[PDB]
Design a protein around this nucleic acid. Structure first.
Length: 90
DNA sequence: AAATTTGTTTACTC
DNA sequence: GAGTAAACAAATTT
């Protein structure tokens, strides 16, 4: 099922986070010191920070792409080393 | 080329 | 409204 209680950031049990994909990406973007991540680093952040997303990569990687291009608060920026994703706080 | 991750789109269960 | 599902074009790497 989903989270049993009010536990904070324990990623060590394969339990679904109680948060939307839109918000999880937004936190992932703002964790980086430069406030942007590539799509691949977003994938690394998700697997690293949650045990649940370590089992069925295809199902949720599709969601991650779907949310990025559907919300106007996610912006793609070309960089020197490749495309990155930022967040509009407004 | 051709392979394949990387991005936009409309519509189904729940 | 979100979580999936698929379908398809665009970047980006073989």
């Amino acid at each position: 099922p989903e989270f049993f209680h009010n536990m904070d950031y324990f990623k060590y049990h394969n339990m679904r986070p109680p948060f939307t994909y839109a918000t999880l990406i937004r936190w992932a973007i703002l964790e980086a010191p430069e406030r942007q991540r590539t799509l691949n680093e977003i994938y690394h952040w998700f697997t690293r920070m949650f045990a649940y997303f370590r089992n069925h990569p295809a199902t949720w990687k599709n969601a991650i792409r779907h949310n990025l291009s559907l919300h106007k608060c996610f912006v793609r920026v070309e960089s020197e080393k490749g495309a990155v994703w930022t967040v509009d706080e407004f």
